[PDB]
Amino acid sequence: QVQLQESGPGLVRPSETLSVTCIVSGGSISNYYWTWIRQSPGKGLEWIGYISDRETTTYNPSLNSRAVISRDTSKNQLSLQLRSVTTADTAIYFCATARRGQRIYGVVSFGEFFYYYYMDVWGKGTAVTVSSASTKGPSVFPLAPSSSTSGGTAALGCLVKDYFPEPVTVSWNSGALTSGVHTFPAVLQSSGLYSLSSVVTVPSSSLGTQTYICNVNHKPSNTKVDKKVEP
Amino acid sequence: YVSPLSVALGETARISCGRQALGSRAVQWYQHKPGQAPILLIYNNQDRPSGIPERFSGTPDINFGTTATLTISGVEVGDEADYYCHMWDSRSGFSWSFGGATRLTVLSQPKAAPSVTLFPPSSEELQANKATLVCLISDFYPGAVTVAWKADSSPVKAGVETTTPSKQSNNKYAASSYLSLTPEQWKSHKSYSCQVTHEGSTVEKTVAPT
Amino acid sequence: ENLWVTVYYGVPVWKDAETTLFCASDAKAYDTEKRNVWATHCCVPTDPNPQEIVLENVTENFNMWKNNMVEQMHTDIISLWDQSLKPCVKLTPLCVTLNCTDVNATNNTEEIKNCSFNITTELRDKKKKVYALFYKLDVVPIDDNNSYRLINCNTSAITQACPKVSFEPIPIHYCAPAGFAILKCNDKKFNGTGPCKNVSTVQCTHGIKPVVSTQLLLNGSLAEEEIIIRSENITNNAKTIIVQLNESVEINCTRPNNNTRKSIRIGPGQWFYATGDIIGDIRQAHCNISRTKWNKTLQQVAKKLREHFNKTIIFNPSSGGDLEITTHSFNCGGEFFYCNTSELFNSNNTITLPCRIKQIINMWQRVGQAMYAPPIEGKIRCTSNITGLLLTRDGNNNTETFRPGGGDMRDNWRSELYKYKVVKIEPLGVAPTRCKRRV
Ligand SMILES: *[C@@H]1O[C@H](CO)[C@@H](O[C@@H]2O[C@H](CO)[C@@H](O[C@@H]3O[C@H](CO[C@H]4O[C@H](CO)[C@@H](O)[C@H](O[C@H]5O[C@H](CO)[C@@H](O)[C@H](O)[C@@H]5O)[C@@H]4O)[C@@H](O)[C@H](O[C@H]4O[C@H](CO)[C@@H](O)[C@H](O)[C@@H]4O)[C@@H]3O)[C@H](O)[C@H]2NC(C)=O)[C@H](O)[C@H]1NC(C)=O
Ligand SMILES: *[C@@H]1O[C@H](CO)[C@@H](O[C@@H]2O[C@H](CO)[C@@H](O[C@@H]3O[C@H](CO)[C@@H](O)[C@H](O[C@H]4O[C@H](CO)[C@@H](O)[C@H](O)[C@@H]4O)[C@@H]3O)[C@H](O)[C@H]2NC(C)=O)[C@H](O)[C@H]1NC(C)=O
Ligand SMILES: *[C@@H]1O[C@H](CO)[C@@H](O[C@@H]2O[C@H](CO)[C@@H](O)[C@H](O)[C@H]2NC(C)=O)[C@H](O)[C@H]1NC(C)=O
Ligand SMILES: *[C@@H]1O[C@H](CO)[C@@H](O)[C@H](O)[C@H]1NC(C)=O
Ligand SMILES: *[C@@H]1O[C@H](CO)[C@@H](O)[C@H](O)[C@H]1NC(C)=O
Ligand SMILES: *[C@@H]1O[C@H](CO)[C@@H](O)[C@H](O)[C@H]1NC(C)=O
């Protein structure tokens, strides 16, 4: 019954304050615990800190010097600030609702129990790169149909040329066409700029003109590019 | 860092938890696909949240000495992901780190031939005084390919940029190769060909200037 | 009219005396584990069936507090303990400086300590660094927590108890020699001292278990009908107060820790038994008694206490003495428990007592030879019957306060030797009859 939604910058300069925000829809933020986990590339995922229902924080000893987690009461949202970020802090930042269980192995009066936390509901996750390099808008050039296989099918697409940083979200006809769509992984060029391709397999009877437009969005650069494709 | 596990398709698999406990314990088991949200399979050693199937299960510590193992029955293509074993015991303090990742790999999957599509540089890119031949490779397994480019007979070997294969929602792999040229270099040659070798087989697609 | 003395030999006449009584124990097997300290290498087997002869019309004055059987048993138990410890391994070279750290647990208190130290090897020239766990009571910091010695090493030498000899009390019957006899008070409501109307004689006593215990008494015999309050002098606060229950309260004592024994050789044939690392959870020892049964027991005690002093009767914990007097100390399965009875004397939701453990011990206030109780493998659990109490007055007639005490171990022997008394027969009688011998 609970849905989390991470929002964040995508890019942050080194030696700055990284901020991310996690919008909760399902319930109250002062009933369950909340926590942040990050997945930096080429490393296993790291639990960085949690915030209670009571507004009491606890941080991982490695990042405790640099981290602060907060809970907004009016908005069902929780933030994570991280001061003096570096190249290492580049990661996919997930938020998740944590649940405190107590494991009791003997008598309660003596102690003989320990608290444990487990994160049942996760958010989708927000990618965050840390780099001195500036933001670049993607150049969108349309890939024409070759006119490709034996009928019905033929292939067209859209090229998203060098941009920075990841990610780019691509849809077709403002998400009207879902059949045949396949957006590929981007390539990091020696330039230091990512480039991807998105392609749609449509029948050669449908072409044409069905007026196929690809809708590109790059949230760091704030550039929404709609481009027609045609033989 | 990650430890590799290999399992035949349809056979049951048991995932050993690193750092096994010193006292009574309440482990968690997290399934994590690369790029996607982690999903916990087990929160208390036996218990699974609603919606997780009955295939996954973890060992209770009814009698001390038992070792934490995540048991997956009927292993399928979709089960292939990273598994983390979060460990909490009575003796050790606050467990901050999750367990070392366990890379499950599902063996004996059906091999798929690569669907290559070579696109010539777009008219509007040539208008910008640049050219990139785009060779897109989809729906292939195992995800291991070597891309070689050709101008006529001669191999290009320069301005070649290629992504390592990454999985798609089909559970097959998808890779793309980019060959940057000048518009004049694109026009100079007769045709250009993208050779994609998948295992023994090699698929070639050829495109020429109109 | 002419009366003459006439000698009668074997008249039933006796006088109060004190003689050397001897041990008697029923023929128990003891085959896989044997030679407990009270049976020893040899004790005399009892009669297949001992005879108790009711002495009709006899009224005899008893005194449990001036009883000599108590003083003999006390000196017997002490001597027996020394005979058992003599051949065992002595841990004089275990007084090296100890490098100690706390054991792994959740940060809520740490009694238990993991201690590394050099020890002499089987070779004289060579030395070994070993580790062992010790309880906080056994050790004291020589300077800092960085390193520690054993508590005893400054005061006196130490000796390990042999792992074969068991601390389990067994029934022991005390017997008198020929020409003497034991008189048993058969009276149900028998006070400590005074005349006993219903008396019997026996050659040997009932099976008394030598249960070493403090504050509350364990596995005794229960007083029939009404609970009996015994004291040497009720108005004197210095003398303790024996209580004997009629309905037994039961006590459940466990050490949940699954300890391990580590045989480290400290020597030519010398094997010191250390505590290895604990397996599983860190749970401290405890004892449970039923809140309903205890509160009923303590109720009935206050009623029969008011027969003497008669007025407010209060119970408080022990405020005087060492760690061994203040807590309810006893043995359970080999380990020596020291239980905090402040819960009980402060007047099924069972009342739980915090029990600490000590391995180095000096019982009967013994100064000099200290004993190392070897660690016991696995989880410990015992279940005992609480039959009596040992109380003490603070020392008025406005409010009375009774604290538990174990000022003398003799009290425990008294609690079962109340009903017995030693006498010597004087079989020569002379009396007048009209009978003269041949001239
Ligand atoms: C403990 O202490 C007590 C008290 O001091 C002692 O009890 C006394 O014992 C003496 C004997 O040693 C008794 O004196 C004798 O009394 C009998 C009793 O009379 C008989 O006749 C009646 C029948 O109508 C009846 O009253 C009696 O019944 C009782 O006795 C029977 C025994 O069969 C018994 O089963 C019952 O329980 C009854 O209680 C009984 O039938 C009397 O017969 C005696 O005279 C004979 O013996 C003497 C010599 O001993 C002799 O001189 C006579 O010529 C005659 O042959 C004798 O007077 C006395 O009654 C008891 N009670 C007292 C004094 O109060 C006892 O000795 C001690 N016990 C022990 C075990 O040591
Ligand atoms: C335990 O059990 C018995 C229960 O009777 C008890 O033994 C005797 O008790 C009394 C009282 O402690 C002691 O003697 C008495 O002392 C008082 C006070 O001085 C006197 O008033 C008594 O006189 C009575 O007896 C006279 C006899 O001629 C009669 O004239 C008349 O009946 C008087 O009331 C009496 O002297 C006595 O010393 C003890 N002990 C013994 C061995 O007899 C005992 O006290 C109880 N309690 C304890 C703590 O032991
Ligand atoms: C004290 O008196 C009691 C009862 O008056 C006696 O107990 C009896 O002892 C005989 C053995 O000689 C048994 O056969 C009976 O069963 C006992 N009676 C009861 C009621 O149980 C005995 O003379 C004395 N007590 C003891 C312990 O010997
Ligand atoms: C034990 O003896 C060695 C020398 O053999 C010494 O280096 C060490 O300091 C001793 N151990 C401790 C805890 O002092
Ligand atoms: C032994 O004692 C020293 C203090 O001098 C301490 O630094 C060291 O950690 C101890 N060694 C061990 C193994 O406990
Ligand atoms: C009994 O108690 C009082 C002390 O309260 C004392 O004066 C008296 O002499 C004592 N008598 C005996 C026999 O202990």
Numbering used by the authors:
A (entry chain H): 1 to 82, 82A, 82B, 82C, 83 to 100, 100A, 100B, 100C, ...
B (entry chain L): 7 to 67, 67A, 67B, 67C, 68 to 95, 95A, 95B, 95C, ...
C (entry chain G): 32 to 140, 152 to 189, 191 to 309, 312 to 321, 321A, 322 to 354, 357 to 393, 411 to 458, ...
Task: Show me the paper's own sentences about this structure.
We first generated a construct based on the SOSIP.v4.2 design, but to improve the quality, stability, and yield of ConM SOSIP.v4.2, we added a second intermolecular disulfide bond between residues 73 in gp120 and 561 in gp41 (SOSIP.v5.2)5 and a number of amino acid changes in the trimer interface derived from the BG505 sequence, collectively termed TD8. We named the construct that incorporated all of these changes ConM SOSIP.v7. The intersubunit C73-C561 disulfide bond could not be confirmed in the structure because the region around residue C561 lacked interpretable electron density. On each ConM SOSIP.v7 monomer, 49 glycan saccharide residues of glycans at 16 of the 30 predicted that Asn-X-Ser/Thr sequons had interpretable electron density. Overall, the ConM SOSIP.v7 trimer has high structural similarity with trimers from clade A (BG505 SOSIP.664), clade C (16055 NFL TD CC), and clade G (X1193.c1 SOSIP.664), as well as membrane-derived native trimers from clade B (JRFL Env from which the cytoplasmic tail was removed (ΔCT)), with Cα root mean square deviations of 0.80 Å, 0.60 Å, 0.79 Å, and 1.05 Å, respectively. The overall structural similarity confirms that the ConM SOSIP.v7 trimer, based on a consensus sequence, mimics the native Env trimer conformation. Interactions between ConM SOSIP.v7 and bNAbs PGT124 and 35O22 are similar to those reported for other trimers in that PGT124 recognizes the N332 glycan and the 324GDIR327 motif at the V3 loop base and 35O22 interacts at the gp120/gp41 interface. ConM contains 14 residues that are rarer than equipositional residues of BG505 while BG505 contains 51 rarer residues. The crystal structure described here provides a useful starting point for designing future immunogens.
